[PDB]
Amino acid sequence: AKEIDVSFVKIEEVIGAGEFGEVYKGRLKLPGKREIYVAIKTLKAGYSEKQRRDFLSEASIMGQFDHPNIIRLEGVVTKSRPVMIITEFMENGALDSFLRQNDGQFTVIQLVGMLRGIAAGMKYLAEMNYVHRDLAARNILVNSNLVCKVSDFIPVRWTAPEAIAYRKFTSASDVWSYGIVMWEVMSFGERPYWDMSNQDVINAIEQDYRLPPPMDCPAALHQLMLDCWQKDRNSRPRFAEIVNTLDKMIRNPASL
């Protein structure tokens, strides 16, 4: 939680209207250092002091993390009003919109690279005993060189059955979500289970329906989704094995 002077920040265009408030693109120029682009998250106007505390405890959480695939926290503005959270800028926005606007324009190996980055960052999070519970493509950001970073610090079709039937949230149920993200990525942003209702998804998962391979999806990658969707949460691979599996595919591209 490093303290940033508001005068080192210029606020440019809006780039979203989040839960808590708006997100702006801006410029950060600290003394003696090269200017970088940043994302500036604000709290909705009129926020209460308890809403401020909640907001600033979100930042304390993101400041614990230092991983190439987790969104970097640059600092906070707390000495002046309004409060702001400064994070690193991701030029290409959320992964789901990004694939949807670039349908077919990335090779299989580039998509496995992004899936590998997401896994590495999920592994880091699991290793520090944080459960995300909202892992979806819309919560993954993409920078200018296609590096994917986990942000967002119940969506039924992304959630493991034991998190849709008994409120048990573990890294193992994050892995189920990761599988869904894999399907979203390989289909260039198709909606999981399409127009099925939330309850149709629940009933179909319970009778062992699983998503089919995306078009032109390697069998090996669809097998890894299927492993992520094992009914028993302990038969699912852990993020360590998912990273190692995808590293071996990137290296043995025949695997694909």
Number of helices: 8
The main β sheet shows up as:
5 strands, antiparallel
- Which architecture of the largest domain per CATH? Orthogonal Bundle
CATH topological fold name of the largest domain: Transferase(Phosphotransferase), domain 1
N-C termini distance: 43 Å
Tell me the name of the CATH class of the largest domain: Mainly Alpha
Structure keywords:
256 residues, alpha+beta, Phosphorylase Kinase, domain 1, Transferase(Phosphotransferase), domain 1, five-stranded antiparallel β-sheet, two-stranded antiparallel ribbon, 8 helices, Ephrin type-B receptor 1, transferase, hephb1, monomeric
Describe the protein in words.
This protein is α+β, with helices and mostly antiparallel strands and 256 residues long. It has 2 domains: 6-88, Phosphorylase Kinase, domain 1; 95-255, Orthogonal Bundle (Transferase(Phosphotransferase), domain 1). The protein is 36% helix and 15% strand. The protein contains 8 helices and 7 strands. It has helices spanning 49-62, 95-100, 108-127, 162-165, 171-186, 198-206, 219-228, 239-251; strands at residues 9-17, 22-28, 36-42, 73-77, 84-88, 140-142, 148-150. The strands form 2 sheets. It has a 5-stranded antiparallel beta sheet, covered by helices on one side. It has a two-stranded antiparallel ribbon with strand order 6-7. A hairpin with a 5-residue loop joins strand 6 (140-142) and strand 7 (148-150). Helix 5 packs antiparallel against helix 7 (219-228). The longest helix has 20 residues, at 108-127. It starts with 8 loop residues before the first strand and ends in a 5-residue tail after the last helix. The PDB classes it as transferase. The entry lists the keywords hephb1, transferase. The assembly is monomeric. The entry is titled "Crystal structure of hEphB1 in apo form". The protein is Ephrin type-B receptor 1.
